[PDB]
Amino acid sequence: NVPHKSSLPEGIRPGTVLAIRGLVPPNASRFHVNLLCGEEQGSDAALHFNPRLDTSEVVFNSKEQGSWGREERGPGVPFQRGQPFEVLIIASDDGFKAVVGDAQYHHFRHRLPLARVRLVEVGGDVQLDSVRIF
Amino acid sequence: VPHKSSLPEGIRPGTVLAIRGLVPPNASRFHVNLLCGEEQGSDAALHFNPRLDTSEVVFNSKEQGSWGREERGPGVPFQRGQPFEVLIIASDDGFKAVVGDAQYHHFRHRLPLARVRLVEVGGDVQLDSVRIF
Numbered sequence: 001n002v003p004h005k006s007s008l009p010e011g012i013r014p015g016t017v018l019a020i021r022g023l024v025p026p027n028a029s030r031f032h033v034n035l036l037c038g039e040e041q042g043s044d045a046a047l048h049f050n051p052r053l054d055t056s057e058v059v060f061n062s063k064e065q066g067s068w069g070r071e072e073r074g075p076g077v078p079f080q081r082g083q084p085f086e087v088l089i090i091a092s093d094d095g096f097k098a099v100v101g102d103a104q105y106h107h108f109r110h111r112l113p114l115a116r117v118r119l120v121e122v123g124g125d126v127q128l129d130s131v132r133i134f
Numbered sequence: 135v136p137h138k139s140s141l142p143e144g145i146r147p148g149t150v151l152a153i154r155g156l157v158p159p160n161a162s163r164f165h166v167n168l169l170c171g172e173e174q175g176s177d178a179a180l181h182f183n184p185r186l187d188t189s190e191v192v193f194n195s196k197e198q199g200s201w202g203r204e205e206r207g208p209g210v211p212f213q214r215g216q217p218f219e220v221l222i223i224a225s226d227d228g229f230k231a232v233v234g235d236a237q238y239h240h241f242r243h244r245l246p247l248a249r250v251r252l253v254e255v256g257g258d259v260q261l262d263s264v265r266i267f
């Protein structure tokens with residue numbers, strides 16, 4: 001499927017909202033939403049949001065100097081193979097609120113400063129209808 | 135039916151008000167208010183007022199019983215008889231209105247955010263959901 005990759009050249013702020021609408025393919029294994037601090041794929045990640053249909057988990061993490069931080073997991077998997085979805089990733093001063101299906105799903109406290117974010121990447125086993133930054 | 139719900143801990147940058155519903159075929163106007171309290175005539179940090187009758191969307195505040203100076207969004211992204219989805223997003227700088235998953239208008243803060251303690255949705259509107267994230 002077609003990944004999304006777009007620049008946020010001045011960072012993000014409390015009140016930035018990433019709105020993603022799409023479809024999980026019926027044979028999906030995993031997909032990801034990354035907020036990265038650079039234009040490279042090994043650059044630091046303020047947020048790695050990784051729904052894993054194969055292992056029935058949604059993992060949250062950060063990455064700094066090529067090392068992953070402590071994983072967090074959301075409660076259950078609010079995605080389903082074959083089904084459309086709406087995700088909001090909402091930046092506050094304290095962290096990211098992941099909203100799925102118009103219900104608060106998980107709160108991930110920041111590890112990296114919002115001002116360092118430079119790139120949003122959405123890829124893997126996912127079909128995207130829209131990716132918007134508000 | 136109107137929505138009125140309390141925000142016990144207030145709202146902060148990163149608060150999102152998500153409203154989904156339908157503009158009735160005979161609608162005149164509806165409103166979304168971010169209010170400082172449960173009473174009649176409370177200060178309003180934000181009054182978001184789509185006006186089907188006059189083809190405008192008015193934004194304003196209210197302090198000491200007096201409406202402030204109105205701002206107007208670009209066009210009216212609502213239609214009688216049609217469903218809509220609105221996000222009202224609080225930032226450090228103001229409130230961002232998103233309609234139909236498109237950025238619509240930005241209203242810079244006038245009142246301190248920490249005084250907002252109530253959300254009200256009323257007027258000519260049928261609500262499917264009101265959620266605060």
Ligand SMILES: OC[C@H]1O[C@@H](O[C@H]2[C@H](O)[C@@H](O)[C@@H](O)O[C@@H]2CO)[C@H](O)[C@@H](O)[C@H]1O
Pocket residue numbers: 048050059060061068071
């Ligand atoms: O932490 C995010 C990264 O996890 C990597 O996989 C982990 C896995 O979650 C864990 O349970 C254990 O098996 O170790 C693995 C490697 O640390 C993913 O490979 C990576 O893409 C991120 O999702």
Ligand SMILES: OC[C@H]1O[C@@H](O[C@H]2[C@H](O)[C@@H](O)[C@@H](O)O[C@@H]2CO)[C@H](O)[C@@H](O)[C@H]1O
Pocket residue numbers: 181183192193194201204
């Ligand atoms: O500004 C929000 C309030 O406006 C009131 O309407 C005003 C009108 O927009 C203004 O031009 C004024 O001079 O006359 C009207 C009031 O008599 C609405 O009545 C009120 O509901 C708010 O929307």
